[PDB]
């Protein structure tokens, strides 16, 4: 029966990950998944399943999964928890409180860490309204807060909404880049296709 898998390694090993503000949303469907090894790796610094549990997970088929993926400095993976607050939650990535899936996060300070300032990685900093479940504000109009709009000028009350991390090699432990993959297991009303082994 087992012949193929979902192209999980195409992110669980991918060369670069998105800035969390523009977090990639790799849609996964039309495949099967041996989720256990996606968990039994002893390499992840975090794997928490919400609305589901790692037990019996391989029985779980879904219409699809929406593997959201990005990079955030290690500790702040805690804002990846449904109903959490925080800048990733408030302004970069909102997990619905009624989430049904899993979250994966590992260190990558060997890979996504470089001197000189890696402007590869970015996150939103100023924003009018809080976010929505699985919504992505890649667009980058420059925020305003008080009397005047910004005209395209950035100054006081006028700041570029995205700032970087700068994963310096000499960073502290709490500063390390966790690559994060959020496997949202969606079962709307379509055929369930992303099944488990056997």
């Amino acid at each position, epitope marked *: 029966n087992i012949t193929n898998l979902c*192209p999980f*390694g*195409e*992110v669980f*090993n*991918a*060369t*670069r*990950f*998105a*800035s969390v503000y*523009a977090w*990639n*949303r*790799k849609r996964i469907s039309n495949c099967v998944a041996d989720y256990s090894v996606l968990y039994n790796s002893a390499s992840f610094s975090t794997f928490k399943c919400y609305g589901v549990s790692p037990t019996k997970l391989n029985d779980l088929c879904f219409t699809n999964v929406y593997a959201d*993926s990005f990079v955030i400095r290690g500790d702040e993976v805690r804002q990846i928890a449904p109903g959490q607050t925080g800048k990733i939650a408030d302004y970069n990535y909102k997990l619905p409180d009624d989430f049904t899936g899993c979250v994966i996060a590992w260190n990558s300070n060997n890979l996504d860490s470089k001197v000189g*300032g*890696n*402007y*590869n*990685y*970015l996150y939103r900093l100023f924003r009018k309204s809080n976010l929505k479940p699985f919504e*992505r504000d*890649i*667009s*980058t109009e*420059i925020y305003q807060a008080g009397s005047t709009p910004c005209n*395209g000028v*950035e100054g006081f009350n006028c700041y*570029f909404p*995205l700032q*970087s991390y700068g994963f310096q090699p000499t960073n502290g432990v709490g500063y390390q880049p966790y690559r994060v993959v959020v496997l949202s297991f969606e079962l709307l009303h379509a055929p369930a296709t992303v099944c488990g082994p056997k």
Partner: antibody
Amino acid sequence: EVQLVESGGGLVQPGRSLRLSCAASGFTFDDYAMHWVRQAPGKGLEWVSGISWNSGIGYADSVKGRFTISRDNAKNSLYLQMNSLRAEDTALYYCAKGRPLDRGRSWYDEIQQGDDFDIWGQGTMVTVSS
Amino acid sequence: IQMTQSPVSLSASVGDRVTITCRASQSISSWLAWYQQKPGKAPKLLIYDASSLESGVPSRFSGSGSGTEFTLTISSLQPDDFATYYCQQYNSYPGTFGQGTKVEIKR
């Protein structure tokens, strides 16, 4: 045809921001890693920035930060938010798609391709005037 | 690193066999692509990997070399090819292109 069309280009004051577009067509824009490559007036081509199938690549040296690539596979339109445009960024910017199938590149294989940029968009001219 | 053609320009009438060579600033493996860019239009792809061929070009083009120096040659020639030509590098993004030698063939 397998075509690129870019917009948002014209006279812009020095340092004033601007956002391009590249409403690519045909090819699975969800796979190949775009790049914005600017040709000076008459002079050579020159890589400005790139972006992987998911996101994130370096830029040219004097253009990091002040530029910001981005895309949206769910819409088919690469972006380029340009900020603090200096004198030299006056050029014609071409959208371009990397040569190889960068859907799921190798995790750990010593490659770092640089034989790319197959299809070039028509190019959206950009000036810097006072 | 860098990638600079050896000629600066050249004219050599139709029906001629000519070479254009690009030398590096360091060992750039062996990946390279070649661009002919007619005046005012969008550059085109000619050779990838510094040797192979891609479907969509007449076979008259040829590429060889490795390491630091590479070469692109045109043997049987047509009116169209009168155009600018560019190399590039790969080692590490950014991978630039280089000066670009013209070809204004007519003598």
